[PDB]
Amino acid sequence: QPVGINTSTTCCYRFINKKIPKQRLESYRRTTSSHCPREAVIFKTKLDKEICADPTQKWVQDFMKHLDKKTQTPKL
Amino acid sequence: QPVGINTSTTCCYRFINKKIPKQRLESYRRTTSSHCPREAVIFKTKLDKEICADPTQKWVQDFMKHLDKKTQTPKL
């Protein structure tokens, strides 16, 4: 259930509860960094495919949080 | 990937420049990988550019940490 400024204070749709990590999913695609309360999210997965994401879920939490880190940089 | 040199040498190394803050963009995506060091926070911006940046390049540090806030996670 959600992390909003009410319970449905989101931007993209059509997603479910729980996936897993038994080989891949890689990149996330969120939107416009200054348009929405939030803006919206896409996940690119399990033999290069896409999913969307707002507003109550863990796997994504951890994904954001996991994705974040892999590697480091400035211009490299 | 972290602090690097040469005329491009690690999984992403394209983007290479100067935008101090966050104010307005098109879309931002973190890590198009599944397999190596490969990724960053790629930023799509206001009559273009597309950048590959993360951890070491501050403005991006803060960007991900500034924008995080803005987009969500799924269903319950």
What is the distance between the alpha carbons of residues A23 and B8, in angstroms, rounded to a whole number? Answer: 29
Name the experiment that determined this structure. NMR
Shortest distance between the Cα of B37 and any Cα of chain A, in A, equals 5
Q: Which of B55, B63, B74 sits opposite A17 (nearest CB)?
A: B74
For B68, half-sphere exposure in the C-beta direction (CA atoms, 13 angstrom radius) is 15
Which of B15, B27, B69 lies nearest to residue A31, judging by beta carbons?
B27
Domain ranges of chain A: 1-76
- Give the gap in angstroms from C-alpha B35 to the nearest C-alpha of chain A: 8
Q: Say which residue the tokens 């960094």 belong to.
A: A33
- The correct answer on CATH 2.40.50.40 for the domain covering B1-76 is yes
CA quadruple A32, A38, A44, A50: dihedral, nearest 10: -90
Vertex A59 angle, CA B11 and B15, to 5°: 25
Please give the structure tokens belonging to residue A48.
Answer: 């290069």
Token pair of A70, please?
């892999």
